[PDB]
Amino acid sequence: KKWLGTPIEEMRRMPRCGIRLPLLRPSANHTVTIRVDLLRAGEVPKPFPTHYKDLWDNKHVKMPCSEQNLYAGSRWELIQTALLNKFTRPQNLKDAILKYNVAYSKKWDFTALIDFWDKVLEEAEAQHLYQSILPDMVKIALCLPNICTQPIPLLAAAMNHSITMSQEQIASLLANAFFCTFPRRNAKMKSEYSSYPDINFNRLFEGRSSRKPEKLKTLFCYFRRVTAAAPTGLVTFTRQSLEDFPEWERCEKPLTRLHVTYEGTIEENGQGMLQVDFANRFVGGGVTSAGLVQEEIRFLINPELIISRLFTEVLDHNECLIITGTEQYSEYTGYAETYRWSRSHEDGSERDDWQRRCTEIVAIDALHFRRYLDQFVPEKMRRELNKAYCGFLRPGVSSENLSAVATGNWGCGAFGGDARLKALIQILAAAAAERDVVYFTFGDSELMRDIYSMHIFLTERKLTVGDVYKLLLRYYNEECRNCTPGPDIKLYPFIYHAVES
Ligand SMILES: Cn1c(=S)c2[nH]c(SCC(=O)N3CCOCC3)nc2n(C)c1=O
Ligand SMILES: C[As](C)(=O)[O-]
């Protein structure tokens, strides 16, 4: 079979499973950058406040249009002068960006941007780029102070805080990121913002990887769409940090349901489910540089995700980022060296009562394991359980109103994670958060069968979360702690034998 377990049609999905949303309102823990009283389906949201207000401090985004962005001269005036010039050749765009980035004129390479424009695009495509797309991107970037009128707080470590902004606001911010206008976000040896991801796009322009043209095609598809017709919805970014984590060995909860399949993807076949982003602790990973696996791909096809890098501090072990409302603008095939932009995508997702696409993505970063056996250390297993639990738990929500989790081999492949361990870890965290699991093994049919078989074995024997966790601890002591780079017996065979004996 191509899938095993509970039929996916029986799993909960938004919007059907959700409760009616409360009235959208700003508060101490929720920044809302648009006029809620004027929010109407199909209408571009109106910014609140009406006139630009600036904060230039350690708790908010430093906006390029701030009067405090100086060089003294006004860097925003210099950005305007630089970008309001005709572009006909890629050197013109390089020269423009460097006019307000003089300190980086010898550090920043533009080879990929030059090669995209001169050596990848056909003549008519290049002409469309410089006669239409780039000027429209400049115009939306320079409109920033009229679009993003409210200071944007940083989602800093240990904050439980949400930001809800319009897709149009995100588009203006991302156009600024493309033109590398965000101040204090560039230096290799910076102290301020050293714990934040890169936001300016200069590393997308570096080098000769065949991957860069594909990334640029994907992002220009987005920019062409959102400059031609303003998107009308909202997106919410929520940093969540939990303090009370389960005593896993004592957890008496049963496992929940499982659908596991070797076909399909999280983003296409997990519509309306909690979709896992296999994140880097710096959210988005190398999306703005050289990375092109699961997280970076999702950030390219749903580029509104990228703006999380503007304001999201690196995730600590007990934290996640939850993004609701991002829209899919592109389709793709492959990954890494085989990644290719396929075509524009018209997102057909319903919107919720806050005009957010019914798409919820959670960024949870797995650990990297240089040594395979390090991941079976109890402290490391508990770390991964608590990370996934934080990503899945919604404190004030009945289980009946929680969608299934759509996930897969989180932290595996090149990152060193063991897929069978990581599947069981996510199954346990989902059970503790009272959510069902939809697991995509991404072509591995044997893994599908193994996960299904283990799940059915444990559920039929009524093993609790704590019973299973204790078996993981036994496996570590018996096969890992005193162990060769690999254990003598694998995890699932160990579990089967331990339980049946
Ligand atoms: C479940 N699922 C999975 S697993 C997935 N993987 C990728 S890209 C390859 C990748 O991330 N690697 C390979 C080794 O290097 C480290 C990790 N896209 C994915 N999608 C869309 C998905 O739904
Ligand atoms: C003596 As021992 C197996 O607890 O390291």
Side-chain angles (χ1 to χ4, degrees), residues 196-223 225-242 245-246 248 250-261:
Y196 283 75
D198 295 347
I199 180 58
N200 290 324
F201 284 15
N202 48 287
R203 293 199 61 198
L204 287 175
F205 309 148
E206 289 177 342
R208 292 190 194 268
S209 176
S210 63
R211 291 138 70 119
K212 290 304 202 294
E214 301 303 325
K215 294 189 166 195
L216 291 164
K217 287 172 176 172
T218 308
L219 291 164
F220 283 125
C221 177
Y222 163 76
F223 281 121
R225 301 266 310 272
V226 298
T227 59
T232 61
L234 302 189
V235 185
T236 299
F237 301 83
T238 293
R239 195 188 189 92
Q240 173 164 285
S241 186
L242 296 190
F245 284 112
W248 292 95
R250 300 183 66 190
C251 182
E252 293 173 353
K253 290 211 177 71
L255 302 188
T256 57
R257 298 180 296 172
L258 176 66
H259 177 90
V260 60
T261 177

Side-chain angles (χ1 to χ4, degrees), residues 201 204 211-212 214-223 284 286-306 327-332 339 341:
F201 284 15
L204 287 175
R211 291 138 70 119
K212 290 304 202 294
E214 301 303 325
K215 294 189 166 195
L216 291 164
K217 287 172 176 172
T218 308
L219 291 164
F220 283 125
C221 177
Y222 163 76
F223 281 121
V287 63
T288 62
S289 49
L292 200 46
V293 294
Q294 192 256 13
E295 173 166 55
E296 291 94 352
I297 290 169
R298 197 76 199 271
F299 272 57
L300 291 165
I301 68 177
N302 286 39
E304 294 149 347
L305 290 169
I306 293 170
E327 178 159 336
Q328 188 177 336
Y329 293 88
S330 294
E331 301 180 3
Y332 72 99
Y339 174 87
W341 180 79

